[PDB]
Amino acid sequence: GLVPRGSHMPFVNKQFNYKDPVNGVDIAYIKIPNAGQMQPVKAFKIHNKIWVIPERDTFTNPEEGDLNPPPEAKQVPVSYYDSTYLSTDNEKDNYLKGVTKLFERIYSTDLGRMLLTSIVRGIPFWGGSTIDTELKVIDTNCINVIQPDGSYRSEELNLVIIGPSADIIQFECKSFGHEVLNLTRNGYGSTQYIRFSPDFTFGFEESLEVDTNPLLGAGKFATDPAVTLAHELIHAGHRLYGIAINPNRVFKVNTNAYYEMSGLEVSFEELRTFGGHDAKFIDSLQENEFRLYYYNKFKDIASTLNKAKSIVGTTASLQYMKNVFKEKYLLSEDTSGKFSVDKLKFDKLYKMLTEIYTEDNFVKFFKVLNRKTYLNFDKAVFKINIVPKVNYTIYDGFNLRNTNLAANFNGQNTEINNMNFTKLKNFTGLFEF
């Protein structure tokens, strides 16, 4: 089982059922920004600042509202399509309970407690004003919630977990942009939408030589979905603090002849998020440039707060919100009330978000088997069901104590634990080589 942290309150106070009656507070019909023009969807607030929408994501991107295999292109090797997935109440109930269970698995570790805490504290900055002396929310960092009287109220939030779009296995952490600001890269942060499903997982190979070869292996071991969700939450952490690395900054893979012969380039953001040996492929000089860059951005935020004389679109006070961001960014405060970025403190925060919160570290806490590198090749996708405790638990994942599955990651062994996995598609021998 996982490395415990002791008794603690659950991350999700209520055990929601999809059919629970709306109440206009934490079970509600809502609309996402853009909302162009969507029907409200039933959503669930599982924790302060965090909502779950048990629907296929046909909302965050207008060009991605069709769940049929793209009639436009031909299907990519590593993709999976099923337009019917997550269309029924039963599936949505299971989705909710699965996502809930994964949050609790994550929160049961000290590392996950730390990451989820950072995420909740990571309110997207109030940088919406055209007047540089007035604080104003950015409304794409909100959702609209239908209240008991049928009216909408605007609510700020940090994170939404939503079902995948057409390609079921294209999990990703995404967010609404601004035509002037790069919110995920300028220190501000923005509300994060993670496309994720707890109802599928990926197979990988236990031998590094096989896992990193595109032609070998059927995907004998299954990735623990808690690791997959944590990976996306790590991205969400970077993005909420506005320190994500521009996707265009890539490492030309030159440590894997197979990547090389395909000219595969992997984002630094990805290597950072994986951690371990991968993070070293970001060279000292370039990483140092990033840190300076983000340090400067934080200073600009401190400077904006200082100039702030008024606040608009809220009842909350100018003083209260100034302090919320002093707290998010760990700013220092003068005898005269001026805000400053402290260099030790910036380094500490930046490092916590980028070095401490990594996939490789979560693997250590969960004590599961996992890919050893991001620079591998996907083997297969399986259908799973982690909701029944007989299948998967908060403490043990698939590797259930006091059963044959406890030892040697037998629970993740899709051959031994075959009843828990239905292989839907092989990817090996689909790549271009």
Q: Which of 193, 197, 217 is nearest to 207 (CA)?
A: 217
CB 130 to Zn ion: min, Å: 34
* 270 labelled ligand-binding: yes
Q: Which CB atom, from 104 or from 278, has the smaller least distance to Zn ion?
A: 278
Site string for Zn ion, 217-256 (x = CB under 5 A): ----------------------------------------
- Dihedral, CA of residue 409, residue 385, residue 232 and residue 272, to nearest 10: 20
The answer to whether 78 and 427 are in contact (CB under 8 A) is: yes
Q: Which CB atom, from 167 or from 270, has the smaller least distance to Zn ion?
A: 270
CB 9 to Zn ion: min, Å: 29
Residue 133 CB neighbours (<10 A): 11
Site string for Zn ion, 259-298 (x = CB under 5 A): -----------x----------------------------
Q: Which CB atom, from 205 or from 270, has the smaller least distance to Zn ion?
A: 270
The answer to whether 411 and 393 are in contact (CB under 8 A) is: no
CB 231 to Zn ion: min, Å: 6
| CB neighbour list of residue 208: distance below 8 Å, 6 or more residues apart | 372, 373
Q: Which of 12, 203, 4, 7 is nearest to 98 (CA)?
A: 12
Q: Which CB atom, from 247 or from 388, has the smaller least distance to Zn ion?
A: 247
Site string for Zn ion, 142-161 (x = CB under 5 A): --------------------
CB 273 to Zn ion: min, Å: 5
**Residue ranges of E strands in 95-158:** 134-136, 142-146, 152-156
Measured CA to CA, the distance from residue 280 to residue 255 in angstroms comes to 12
Catalytic residues: 232
Q: Which CB atom, from 270 or from 396, has the smaller least distance to Zn ion?
A: 270
* 235 labelled ligand-binding: yes
Residue 354 is given by DSSP the state: I
Q: In what order do the strands lie in the sheet with 159-163?
A: 152-156, 142-146, 27-31, 41-47, 50-56, 159-163, 192-195, 172-174
CB 165 to Zn ion: min, Å: 16
In the region spanning residues 14 to 53, those forming contacts with Zn ion, defined by CB under 5 A, are none
* 179 labelled ligand-binding: no
- Which residues here bind Zn ion, judged by CB under 5 A? 270
Q: Which residues are annotated as a binding site for Zn(2+)?
A: 231, 235, 270
